[PDB]
């Protein structure tokens, strides 16, 4: 698993792979690692496949009650808190899940909150969770700039997941992209890692030690 998200002038950029594996066999290459909490918030999926999916979908319902009551958009901080709180209650029981809650409200701007089953709740600009997190961090650390265009901000996230995909055996498939804005998120497709590689190698020169 290789999931990541980051802040910048354009807002937030979320990118994930889609490989799920049982032992050494690839049980599936079609996983939606991005939980569409609601029109304005996205959660990623690391740790436990179900725990992430289940509670985050739960969380969405929570935001909905909150918005009907206050007649106002819930804030990324309050949402991320709700989640981590519920998670903390089950500390010990054996849950499992590293995650990025991403939103962009009017008052707080674009915000990413990393949250996991330990009860940790971190605010940040760049986050990478996964078995390929180390590789993603590479491409990302060296190229990130707050003033990235939107077009390039997406390409960066894409190339990053790709780097993981290649080296980390437990990562691969197809990258999925999203861009989060003050009006909500926009899906930017699903690109097969198979095809994307050859493309990049060819149009970027990188990946020399690969004959093809």
């Amino acid at each position: 698993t290789t999931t990541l998200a980051f802040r910048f002038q354009g807002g937030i950029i979320v990118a994930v792979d889609s490989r799920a594996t049982a032992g050494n066999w690839v049980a599936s290459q079609t996983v939606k690692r991005v939980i569409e909490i609601n029109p304005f918030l996205l959660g990623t999926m690391a740790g436990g496949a179900a725990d992430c999916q289940f509670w985050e979908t739960w969380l969405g319902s929570q935001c909905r009650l909150h918005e009907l009551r206050e007649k106002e958009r819930i804030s990324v901080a309050a949402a991320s808190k709700i989640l981590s709180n519920l998670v903390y209650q089950y500390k010990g029981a054996g849950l499992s899940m590293g995650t990025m809650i991403c939103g962009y409200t009017r008052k707080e701007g674009p915000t990413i909150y990393y949250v996991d089953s330990d009860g940790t709740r971190l605010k940040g600009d760049i986050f990478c969770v996964g078995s390929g997190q180390t590789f993603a961090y590479g491409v990302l650390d060296s190229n990130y700039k707050w003033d990235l265009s939107v077009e390039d901000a997406l390409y960066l996230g894409k190339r990053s997941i790709l780097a993981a995909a290649h080296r980390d055996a437990y990562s691969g498939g197809s990258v999925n992209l999203y861009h989060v804005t003050e009006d909500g998120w926009i899906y930017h497709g699903n690109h097969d890692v198979g095809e994307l590689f050859w493309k990049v190698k060819e149009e970027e020169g990188s990946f020399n030690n690969v004959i093809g």
Partner: protein, 241 residues
Amino acid sequence: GYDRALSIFSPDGHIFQVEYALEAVKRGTCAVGVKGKNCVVLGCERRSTLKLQDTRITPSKVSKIDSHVVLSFSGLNADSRILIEKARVEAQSHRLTLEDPVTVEYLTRYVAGVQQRYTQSGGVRPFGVSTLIAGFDPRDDEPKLYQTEPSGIYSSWSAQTIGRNSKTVREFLEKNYDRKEPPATVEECVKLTVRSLLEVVQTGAKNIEITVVKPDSDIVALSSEEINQYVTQIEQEKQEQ
């Protein structure tokens, strides 16, 4: 008669016990809330009638709930102290579960929530309090002012008053407070709050409490002199015409 319990409807669809609770709010002293467009001002009156007692720790009728919200009441004194406490705790629990500090409506709602909870089952008696909650939501600049009744209902106002002789003070306010254009100065917004109580205070600024609340958790009580500096300037134009 049908006014004996909270769980019984009169033939015409009333519930008098709750209604009578309100008759007690009228007994208490007068409170008045007045909002501007950059502030909110609460005012009260002091039951200065039987004193040979202390002074130091004398209630101001106005209490802070959070750094950005104050509340004032009228009616059963002892009853009021519990609502103020309960709302204070909740105000801190909200920060604990959502990071964000409470909104003025969320608080008002929580309070009235309690007041209504005490008119549900029998073997319980409705709080004999009516309250005015004023303040500013987090990182927001629109002044807010709400009122709650013993029955459990809450409402927002441009200015409002409760307690004995609240009918009078209300008349006054109505023909003075301009809906289209609220007091644009904390000083005049005060002036207006003062002159209104100056129809039930029975002379002297020794019977008037004023508290001012602005944005950014900035709240501040008023002193006896400052308050008189207005009784002064309004006692001028009074016979000046």
